Amino acid sequence: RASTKVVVVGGGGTIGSSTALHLIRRGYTPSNITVLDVYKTPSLQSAGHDLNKIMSIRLRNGPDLQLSLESLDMWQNDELFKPFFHQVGMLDCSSSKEGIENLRRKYQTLLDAGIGLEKTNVWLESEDEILAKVPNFTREQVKGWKGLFCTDGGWLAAAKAINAIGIFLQDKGVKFGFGDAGTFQQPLFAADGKTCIGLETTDGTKYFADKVVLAAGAWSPTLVDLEDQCVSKAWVFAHIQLTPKEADAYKNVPVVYDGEYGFFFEPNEYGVIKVCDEFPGYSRFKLHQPYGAASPKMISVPRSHAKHPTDTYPDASEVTIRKAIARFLPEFKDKELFNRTMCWCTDTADANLLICEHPKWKNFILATGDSGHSFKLLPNIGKYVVELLEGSLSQEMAGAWRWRPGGDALRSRRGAPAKDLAEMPGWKHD
């Protein structure tokens, strides 16, 4: 272990940072760990390079529950992560007949687990209980709304937390490569052409290691052939600027989320509110040849805002973002938006992670399939990547995260197939 060399591709993003953090915590020697990314520090294009992410408990399968609970504990109690968890609660609400049904089911599932989640997860049946948790709302704004309130949840200062890990890693002596020195191009193989011995970057720099971890997020299926198990998709956000007076009225407000509208966060320290809508995501299919594919293939390739800073998002997303504002922040309907952005994740067909050794390449570990909801696992997801690397990962977890082509990841569990950027005008200003 003190002898084992590991390269983490995508080490500037969420799963890569966590993996590098846990390699150190488990006693790997820091000079033996190499972190590679296109972008330095917290990578500009990482899905974790954000003002804020939601912290909440999700319960779809067994792993989801264990991982959620452990991660919540570390956000609350881990010295490294504590400064970046804002435990302001999260309201999940609805007013549509079908949306309240989904919410009642969410509450029952928490109940049915029977391990105490209903203590910190409270049903809000009347507008007056909603207004007590969110005073900024008015009574007429919340007419007909029902809520499930997670007193345990809140939001995570995402980019700041990733930066904190990176500072820790640098202080311990981990090696880094960025730019074309850190841009993965292909694995390197022993004489057998199937045992991985390292990787090459686009400049020809060859890194040799016992294990290679591919934590390249939405770019993972573009870099190596995942047999179309993963479809990368974009979601959207924009920012609004509050006056100091308005910003004060919103301090410590809980995260508010409605699956038919979107969600928003309390102002950051500069008075900026991030607003998101909720929808099935955007694909951007384009001819590309991932390593290991026999031919160029039509696959969803992120259109990176870091690479194309004039990009915004589609006009259809301008409509739905302004609908979220009108529902949650009706007094701000005339505020101008800025920093319109597309942010990329990669869905699997069943919305579980893809964390496994590549079927044919020994010592090449995939660690992706984040499916748009894994940033909350920053403190602990790396623990299980290292467990897999070591051969100690539980069989139920390995099974849930295994190599498993065959499903429809374009629909995934979103209830509609992502629409493509080629059919959605308004985002490109080239």
Ligand X SMILES: Cc1cc2nc3c(=O)[nH]c(=O)nc-3n(C[C@H](O)[C@H](O)[C@H](O)COP(=O)(O)OP(=O)(O)OC[C@H]3O[C@@H](n4cnc5c(N)ncnc54)[C@H](O)[C@@H]3O)c2cc1C
Does position 368 interact with ligand X (CB under 6 A)? The reply is yes
Three-class SS state of 250: coil
Q: Is residue 96 marked as binding?
A: no
Give me the sign of the Cα torsion angle 277, 85, 10, 291. negative
- Comparing CB distances to ligand X, the nearer of 127 and 353 is 353
3-state helix, strand, coil in the chain (%, to 5): 30, 25, 45
Is 376 annotated as a binding-site member? yes
The nearer residue to ligand X, 218 or 386, going by C-beta atoms, is 218
Total binding residues toward ligand X, as defined by CB under 6 A: 39
* Residue 219 lies near ligand X (rule: CB under 6 A): yes
Nearest distance, CB of residue 109 and ligand X, angstroms: 18
Binding flag, residue 370, ligand X (CB under 6 A)? yes
Residue 46 is a binding residue for ligand X (CB under 6 A): yes
Q: Which member of 142, 223, 253, 385 binds ligand X (CB under 6 A)?
A: 223
Answer for which of 375, 384, 401, 427 binds ligand X (CB under 6 A) is 375
Nearest partner of 210 among 23, 401, 380, 48, judged by Cα: 23
Reduced to 3 states, what is the DSSP secondary structure of residue 168? helix
Sign of CA dihedral 127, 128, 133, 134: positive
Token duo for residue 147 = 């809520």
Footprint (CB under 6 A) of ligand X, residues 166-185: 182-184
Residue 154 binds ligand X, judged by CB under 6 A: no
Quickly list DSSP for 174-231. -EEE-GGGS-EEEEEE-TTSSBEEEEEETT--EEE-SEEEE--GGGHHHHB--TT--E
Closest CA to 212 of 325, 120, 323, 291: 291
**Lookup result for tokens 């979103």:** 414
Q: Is 370 annotated as a binding residue?
A: yes
> Could you say which of 32, 45, 141, 363 contacts ligand X (CB under 6 A)?
45
> In residues, how long is the chain?
430
Q: Say whether residue 352 binds ligand X (CB under 6 A).
A: no
- Selected binder of ligand X within 53, 211, 340, 383 (CB under 6 A): 53
Through-space distance between the first and last CA atoms of the chain, rounded to whole angstroms: 49
Q: In the 8-state DSSP scheme, what is residue 350?
A: S
Q: Is 226 among the residues that bind ligand X (CB under 6 A)?
A: no
In the complex, the smallest distance separating the C-beta of residue 374 from ligand X, rounded to whole angstroms, is 4
| Residue among 12 and 379 whose Cβ is closer to ligand X | 12
Cα separations (Å) of 289 from 12, 218, 284, 298, 316? 24, 15, 15, 9, 30
Task: Compare residues 129 and 420 and give the one whose CB is closer to ligand X.
Answer: 420
- Report which residue's Cβ sits closest to ligand X: 13
The reply, when asked if residue 37 is annotated as ligand binding, is: yes
Based on the shown chain and the rule CB under 6 A, indicate whether residue 329 belongs to the binding site for ligand X: no
Tracing tokens 């299980």 back to the chain, one arrives at: 384
Q: Which residues are annotated as a binding site for FAD?
A: 14-15, 37, 43, 45-48, 54, 184, 370, 374-376
Q: Which residues are annotated as a binding site?
A: 14-15, 37, 43, 45-48, 54, 184, 370, 374-376
User: What are the residues binding ligand X (CB under 6 A)?
Assistant: 9-10, 12-16, 36-39, 43, 45-48, 53-54, 182-184, 215-219, 223, 235, 237, 276, 343, 345, 368, 370, 372-376
